[PDB]
Design a binder for this molecule. Structure first.
Ligand SMILES: Nc1ncnc2c1ncn2[C@@H]1O[C@H](COP(=O)(O)O[C@@H]2[C@H](O)[C@@H](COP(=O)(O)OP(=O)(O)OP(=O)(O)O)O[C@H]2n2cnc3c(=O)[nH]cnc32)[C@@H](O)[C@H]1O
Ligand SMILES: Nc1ncnc2c1ncn2[C@@H]1O[C@H](COP(=O)(O)OP(=O)(O)OP(=O)(O)O)[C@@H](O)[C@H]1O
Ligand SMILES: [Mg+2]
Ligand SMILES: [Mg+2]
Ligand SMILES: [Zn+2]
Ligand SMILES: [Zn+2]
Lengths: 343, 346
DNA sequence: ATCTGTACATGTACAGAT
DNA sequence: ATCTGTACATGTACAGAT
DNA sequence: ATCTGTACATGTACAGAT
DNA sequence: ATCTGTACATGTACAGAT
């Protein structure tokens, strides 16, 4: 039933092989260009993020997310009002992006990438028209197949995480206090998503990657000498429900995969035991996930998992209309055996 | 009953405070000295090991173990006659300890020892001498007196960052317990060679750093023994077993061949055999301790206790310990077991 | 003026003390 | 149930060296 | 400072056993 | 239908060499 759906959603090794071989060619070349040429981004380092690298990518290997992270000296943050997620950066190579302007820096980053792509004749690859606000430089590759790659500029700070995250990452009952303390000793990242043009947003893609690949209360969850859980499978099913709904109804344009990822982090925290995510109980697990996501919509509350004061479902970010709309559509699919899965 | 014993065994904060304040003074000074002038041990780094740093030290804070580890690039090992544990190592600073390519353990240890003795002489803050050398030991042992007697084993160590030696490939069977990711990461840590004998150029592998990790990350659940997790009795069983041996050892010299490492090894095997945190419930301390004794007794009777990291190395081989010694310890354990542990009452 | 090995600053888990 | 000392990991400041 | 080699985890694909 | 074993593929951390 849902096994049958996950089978459809499963990526093929051949497709993975071909898609990766190309994406890596391009990314390696873009990365080479940032240092081996005397740009402001010399020393920038690669960090693969998102669904493909978490092993929760569904349908096809056609969307890849990569951080080009840049370690910066002693940095001063100032929270953009009380948003929790957005900051101004303050205090050498970067002088010419001065307060460090996100858009000015992103523009140069973008300009370089556009130049390097022009010089690529191996592969059919253009640079997508800029979406204002967005921190990505998006590449549209065509093998025969359409593949998109988000190159995300990132500042890496080695200081302790900003105050807004102090109560974030409530993994203590699930992954534990040692894991949490160690995770919060990793750097934090700022990406140039706006709000305006000088605002950066916190990024925990590196932390989310760790969590995805170390998601059990037991150290052996999903390992060769351990028991398989269905945590990732539920994430996939939920992602697919949204993807399918999103491509049918334009009313759902305000919703994205990060909403679902956030909700399931909360579910995993609420239901820490690996036994509460037994493969045999895939149906009820998926169901309790839907129920939870519906409560978030109804209460208009979905807190950033790392930044509790940042509500992704705040009125200011998404209309009541949009939420009620998605509620009805989810409720419908739920109470009619998920017809949309059959497409 | 056993809670009451563990209460006695528990260290006091006051004693910990005083003992540590002194030990650290001495060790910091000894370590500072190694970095001086054209010392062959410049770059040597500190790594605290053993029971005190694993939180399984019992009775008093009176024995501390410290590795002074020294990174040695481009190093070639040759296993000493298929033993698994022992190896030969082959204007550089260590040049002075070589015998045509071969790094002498004893020559190196001797210099190490000489330096330490010299540095201790110059300490008048604290009452601290250097214990007479124990044959078949890699340690330089300090006897500090505070008022109270405290000993500190300074252990010379080579640090190699290469892959662990072949003999350990089947070692550390933690896959069903701590997992494959933990194991892979652990085996990416360096391995250590200490100058224990067999001859004067032989070194022995050391996994004290790994054992420390295991002790402090001993559960199948990541929250085992944490503030938002469930307490197990794994460490408590180790303490009780250590105490049984310590008490027996200081009464009967027949038990001189036995050490705390034997019990530590046995319990690593027990933890592997019983991976679930529920199999080590605090409420079931008695049966947990009992199954541990039963296991240790089987090891003695079958004369088999494999090094947890080096499976082919049997710590209870006839060549290391007499049948007599094992049977003796068997009877004494069996006795304590079947008479309510009278020796705990001392 | 810049660079650096060393010491310190900051944070938390663990366990003992209250 | 809360509070506190020690160990340990990671970041950063800086007197002495260059 | 950069690059390659090695080991193994997380996947997929599929046959034979249950 | 599911489970187990093997083969094949990609990702990633880190050591040793340059
Ligand atoms: N903080 C960030 N760290 C890393 N990458 C980021 C971050 N913020 C944004 N990005 C990347 O920028 C591109 C566009 O982002 P938008 O902010 O315009 O909207 C995001 C996007 O449309 C959607 C899905 O993101 P992603 O492709 O990473 O999803 P996935 O988890 O890989 O799954 P699938 O590819 O299978 O769907 O989510 C939106 N979004 C909103 N907030 C966030 C956030 O904090 N992190 C990530 N996405 C977010 C994208 O490439 C995005 O990754
Ligand atoms: N025979 C041995 N083989 C391998 N490692 C050993 C051996 N003996 C001791 N060690 C290592 O040296 C460490 C310190 O030795 P020591 O005898 O002090 O034991 P311990 O675990 O500290 O317990 P305690 O000191 O309370 O008896 C041990 O924890 C272990 O890692
Ligand atoms: Mg993605
Ligand atoms: Mg000790
Ligand atoms: Zn799992
Ligand atoms: Zn425990």
């Amino acid at each position: 039933k849902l096994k049958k759906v996950l089978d459809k959603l499963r990526l093929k090794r051949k497709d993975i092989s071909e898609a990766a071989e190309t994406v890596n060619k391009v990314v390696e070349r873009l990365l080479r260009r940032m240092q081996k040429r005397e740009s402001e981004f010399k020393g920038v380092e690669q960090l693969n993020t998102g669904s493909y690298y978490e092993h929760v990518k569904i349908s096809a290997p056609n969307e890849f997310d990569v951080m080009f992270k840049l370690e910066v000296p002693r940095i001063e943050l100032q929270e953009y009002y009380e948003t929790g997620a957005f900051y101004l950066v303050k205090f050498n190579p970067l002088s010419h992006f001065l307060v460090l302007s996100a858009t000015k820096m992103l523009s140069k980053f973008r300009k370089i990438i556009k130049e390097e792509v022009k010089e690529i004749k191996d592969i059919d690859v253009s640079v997508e028209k800029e979406k204002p606000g967005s921190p990505a430089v998006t590449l549209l590759i065509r093998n025969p197949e359409e593949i998109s790659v988000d190159i995300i500029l990132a500042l890496e700070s080695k200081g302790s995480w900003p105050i807004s995250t102090k109560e974030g990452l409530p993994i203590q009952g699930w992954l534990g206090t040692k894991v949490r303390t160690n995770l919060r000793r990793e750097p934090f990242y700022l990406v140039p998503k706006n709000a305006q043009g000088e605002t950066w947003r916190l990024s925990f893609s590196h932390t989310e990657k760790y969590i995805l690949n170390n998601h059990g209360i037991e150290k052996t969850c999903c390992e060769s000498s351990g028991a398989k859980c269905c945590r990732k499978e539920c994430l996939k099913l939920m992602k697919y429900l949204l993807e399918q709904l999103k491509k049918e109804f334009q009313e759902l344009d305000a919703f994205c995969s990060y909403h679902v990822k956030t909700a399931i982090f909360h579910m995993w925290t609420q239901d820490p035991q690996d036994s509460q995510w037994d493969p045999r109980n895939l149906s009820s697990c998926f169901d309790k996930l839907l129920a939870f996501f519906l409560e978030c919509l109804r209460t208009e509350k979905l807190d950033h998992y790392f930044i509790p004061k940042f509500n992704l479902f705040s009125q200011e970010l998404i209309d009541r209309k949009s939420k009620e709309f998605l509620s009805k559509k989810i409720e419908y699919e739920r109470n009619n055996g998920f017809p949309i899965f059959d497409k």
